[PDB]
Amino acid sequence: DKISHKIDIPDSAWTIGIGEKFKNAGHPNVKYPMIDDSYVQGAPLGGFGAGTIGRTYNGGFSRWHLEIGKNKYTTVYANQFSVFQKVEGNKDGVAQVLYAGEPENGYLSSWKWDYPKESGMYYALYPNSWYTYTNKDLPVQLAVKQFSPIIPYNYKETSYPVAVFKWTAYNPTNKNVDVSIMFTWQNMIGFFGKQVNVNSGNFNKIIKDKSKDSEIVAAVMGNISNDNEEWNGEYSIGVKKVPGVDISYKAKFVTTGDGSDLWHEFSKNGILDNKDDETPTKQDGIGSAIAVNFKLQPGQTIEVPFALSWDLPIMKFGGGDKWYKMYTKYFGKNGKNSFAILKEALNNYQKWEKMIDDWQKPILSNKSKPDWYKTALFNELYYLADGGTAWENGKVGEKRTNNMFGLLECFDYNYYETLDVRFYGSFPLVMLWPDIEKQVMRQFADTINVQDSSEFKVGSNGAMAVKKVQGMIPHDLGSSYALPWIKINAYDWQNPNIWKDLNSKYVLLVYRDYVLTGKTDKEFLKYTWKSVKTALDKLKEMDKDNDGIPDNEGIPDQTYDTWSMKGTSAYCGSLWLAALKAAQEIGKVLKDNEAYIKYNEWYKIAQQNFEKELWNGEYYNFDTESDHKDSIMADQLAGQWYADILRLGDILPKDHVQKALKKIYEFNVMKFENGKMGAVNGMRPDGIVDESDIQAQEVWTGVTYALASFMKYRGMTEEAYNTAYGVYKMTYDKSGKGYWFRTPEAWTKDGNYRASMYMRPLSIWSMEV
Ligand SMILES: *[C@H]1O[C@H](CO)[C@@H](O)[C@H](O)[C@H]1F
Numbered sequence: 007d008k009i010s011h012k013i014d015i016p017d018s019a020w021t022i023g024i025g026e027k028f029k030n031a032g033h034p035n036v037k038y039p040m041i042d043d044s045y046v047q048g049a050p051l052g053g054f055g056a057g058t059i060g061r062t063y064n065g066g067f068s069r070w071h072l073e074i075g076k077n078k079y080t081t082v083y084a085n086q087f088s089v090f091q092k093v094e095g096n097k098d099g100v101a102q103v104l105y106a107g108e109p110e111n112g113y114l115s116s117w118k119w120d121y122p123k124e125s126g127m128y129y130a131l132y133p134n135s136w137y138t139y140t141n142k143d144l145p146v147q148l149a150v151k152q153f154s155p156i157i158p159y160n161y162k163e164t165s166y167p168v169a170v171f172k173w174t175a176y177n178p179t180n181k182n183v184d185v186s187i188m189f190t191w192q193n194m195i196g197f198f199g200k201q202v203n204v205n206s207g208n209f210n211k212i213i214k215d216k217s218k219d220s221e222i223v224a225a226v227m228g229n230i231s232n233d234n235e236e237w238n239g240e241y242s243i244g245v246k247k248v249p250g251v252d253i254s255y256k257a258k259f260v261t262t263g264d265g266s267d268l269w270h271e272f273s274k275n276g277i278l279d280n281k282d283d284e285t286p287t288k289q290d291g292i293g294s295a296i297a298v299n300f301k302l303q304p305g306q307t308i309e310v311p312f313a314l315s316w317d318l319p320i321m322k323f324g325g326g327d328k329w330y331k332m333y334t335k336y337f338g339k340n341g342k343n344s345f346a347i348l349k350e351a352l353n354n355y356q357k358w359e360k361m362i363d364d365w366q367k368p369i370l371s372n373k374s375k376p377d378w379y380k381t382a383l384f385n386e387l388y389y390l391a392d393g394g395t396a397w398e399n400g401k402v403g404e405k406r407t408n409n410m411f412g413l414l415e416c417f418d419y420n421y422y423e424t425l426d427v428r429f430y431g432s433f434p435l436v437m438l439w440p441d442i443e444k445q446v447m448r449q450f451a452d453t454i455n456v457q458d459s460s461e462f463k464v465g466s467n468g469a470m471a472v473k474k475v476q477g478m479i480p481h482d483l484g485s486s487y488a489l490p491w492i493k494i495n496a497y498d499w500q501n502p503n504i505w506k507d508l509n510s511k512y513v514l515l516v517y518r519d520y521v522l523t524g525k526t527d528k529e530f531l532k533y534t535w536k537s538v539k540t541a542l543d544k545l546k547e548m549d550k551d552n553d554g555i556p557d558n559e560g561i562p563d564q565t566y567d568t569w570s571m572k573g574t575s576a577y578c579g580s581l582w583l584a585a586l587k588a589a590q591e592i593g594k595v596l597k598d599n600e601a602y603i604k605y606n607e608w609y610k611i612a613q614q615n616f617e618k619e620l621w622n623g624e625y626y627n628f629d630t631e632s633d634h635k636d637s638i639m640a641d642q643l644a645g646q647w648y649a650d651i652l653r654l655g656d657i658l659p660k661d662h663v664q665k666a667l668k669k670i671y672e673f674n675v676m677k678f679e680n681g682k683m684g685a686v687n688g689m690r691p692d693g694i695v696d697e698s699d700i701q702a703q704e705v706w707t708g709v710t711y712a713l714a715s716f717m718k719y720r721g722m723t724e725e726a727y728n729t730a731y732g733v734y735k736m737t738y739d740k741s742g743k744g745y746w747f748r749t750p751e752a753w754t755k756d757g758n759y760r761a762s763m764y765m766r767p768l769s770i771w772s773m774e775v
């Protein structure tokens with residue numbers, strides 16, 4: 007490997023061999039069908055709300071999130087980089103697709119598949135990833151750095167449906183070598199959203215943009231239809247000319263054929279026919295190819311950038327609504343702008359790289375932090391793009407000042423902005439994209455007094471319940487299968503209108519968002535203040551016995567939605583205490599004296615009774631009335647965790663908090679698989695895992711990372727990082743279960759999982775507060 011020295015891969019990048027088999031992989035541990043796309047994954051490409059494309063460590067474009075809210079795992083075999091090399095003096099050259107696999111059927115059988123094992127590595131530190139190619143039959147070593155411009159405090163380039171592939175080639179040998187790199191792409195119009203005639207009218211054109219000291223050559227793969235529908239738009243691939251390289255292309259090859267129309271050209275001398283052909287197809291799939299060819303002398307290095315863009319301006323949800331995607335603000339809405347997007351990337355990628363380096367550098371340069379922690383911190387952010395992210399720039403056929411946003415809980419439970427989970431998962435947004443975070447919170451503020459008296463069947467018990475109650479915060483802002491932002495509370499497993507955590511978490515999120523953006527945004531507090539007061543006032547009515555604390559009702563009425571709480575719970579009770587203290591502080595800021603006095607009164611009473619009812623001398627009991635009320639819950643002091651972040655001081659005595667955290671580390675971490683797998687949710691005081699429900703026997707990745715941040719704030723530095731390390735290990739390490747770029751909600755002691763590609767573990771960013 008001589009190519010690594012010619013590029014700059016951070017030591018904290020996650021790494022795996024190209025073509026590596028992984029033997030230890032986990033699988034779903036639930037009764038019903040659950041997504042398991044395998045461990046062959048990679049860091050995604052694509053901006054927020056753009057639709058994303060997962061190119062795996064084996065090289066294939068395989069995890070398709072272009073249909074917003076959906077996960078489709080299938081390798082589109084025509085989409086590849088390929089290489090040709092010929093040593094000067096040799097009769098023939100060699101050609102090879104850079105994909106560690108082959109197609110299932112006879113399509114593209116002429117291409118040279120099965121990139122060999124032990125001949126290259128994949129690296130990832132989101133939003134960047136890299137591949138190196140170090141192959142005994144390829145004298146010139148090659149590397150590529152690929153990325154999308156995902157940039158904190160930037161809401162423009164961060165939205166773009168574009169990827170850059172920056173190639174580096176180096177000749178370590180003593181002979182001249184002719185080298186070609188070719189990018190192939192299928193015209194994927196009709197891949198989704200088209201019921202019939204899926205390729206019909208697809209056509210490819212070549213764009214040659216020549217202007218002093220710039221040449222870009224690109225293929226634009228579109229459809230003859232000028233219709234404005236979810237399925238219609240354009241894909242583009244292309245390359246920017248650099249000194250010493252020539253560009254060739256082929257506008258149209260058949261993807262539903264043996265591929266020899268293209269490959270016979272590339273495999274001969276690495277030079278394509280430059281044949282333009284705009285003839286639209288009928289049944290056959292078609293694609294385009296862009297290649298560069300150059301000669302590398304001994305010791306010579308060349309860099310050449312390719313790019314990929316996709317202009318699919320309209321997202322459609324299952325309930326029928328069509329919306330424009332965010333990036334259309336910058337490029338237009340007509341779906342004929344793929345080249346413009348591509349060109350912007352090819353002309354500005356070096357600037358984008360520096361912007362990404364500038365935001366990663368403060369963390370990467372901190373030598374007090376272990377590299378494994380940095381691996382997790384950056385790579386967990388994949389989910390902000392890969393979580394079915396929806397970011398609208400207008401309803402089709404409708405202008406507003408704001409652009410609504412939504413991140414999925416996950417794909418198995420297809421619910422946007424599950425607030426009980428975003429309490430954990432939204433840290434990267436408040437810390438790095440705070441304008442998005444505040445918009446989402448205003449979305450919730452706007453729903454507070456919505457009432458929908460239509461009824462739905464509750465999944466857990468079969469009872470009927472009202473969809474949305476006035477003054478209750480919704481569980482979610484809908485489903486991609488229905489009407490995001492329009493029909494809220496799509497979730498029906500439990501009735502969220504009786505949950506005891508949503509209203510308090512809402513208030514805590516509001517105040518968090520004020521504190522972590524500098525305590526200057528009074529307008530955000532003013533916007534949300536009525537909803538905050540309403541939320542707390544409604545939750546106070548759920549106190550059955552006048553101890554000043556809402557009563558959990560002996561069913562799962564909070565985020566642990568199969569784990570029953572009854573009476574005063576440590577979890578919901580501490581959240582309530584903290585929410586009251588937050589609301590007192592907002593009341594002071596907004597000069598609402600009567601609110602300050604009322605919430606201060608409620609706080610003092612609740613605090614006294616919480617301590618009396620739950621403090622057992624070692625930790626806080628799970629609750630006051632359940633069968634296993636004395637279980638040690640990993641999340642027992644969630645309200646104090648947030649109070650620390652919000653700078654609200656002690657809601658419970660420091661000594662008691664430290665004892666409880668130490669107990670959790672001693673039991674829920676260290677007595678669960680020797681502390682190598684995170685914090686199990688519930689442990690009996692005899693040191694055996696609580697079996698009252700499956701969720702008690704699960705480690706929740708986002709709960710564990712948040713607990714690690716709580717420990718860190720409280721000076722339990724070793725415990726914090728040891729607790730978090732178990733989650734990193736399970737997710738990323740060779741000894742783990744192969745969950746990279748699909749971190750699940752949960753695993754059990756056998757390491758098998760529930761709900762891959764999950765929102766909650768974004769909470770690792772709470773460790774950076
Ligand atoms: C999705 O599932 C999780 C449990 O894994 C719940 O906390 C959320 O409320 C639900 F929407």
Ligand SMILES: [Ca+2]
Pocket residue numbers: 548549550551552553554555556557573574
């Ligand atoms: Ca009560």
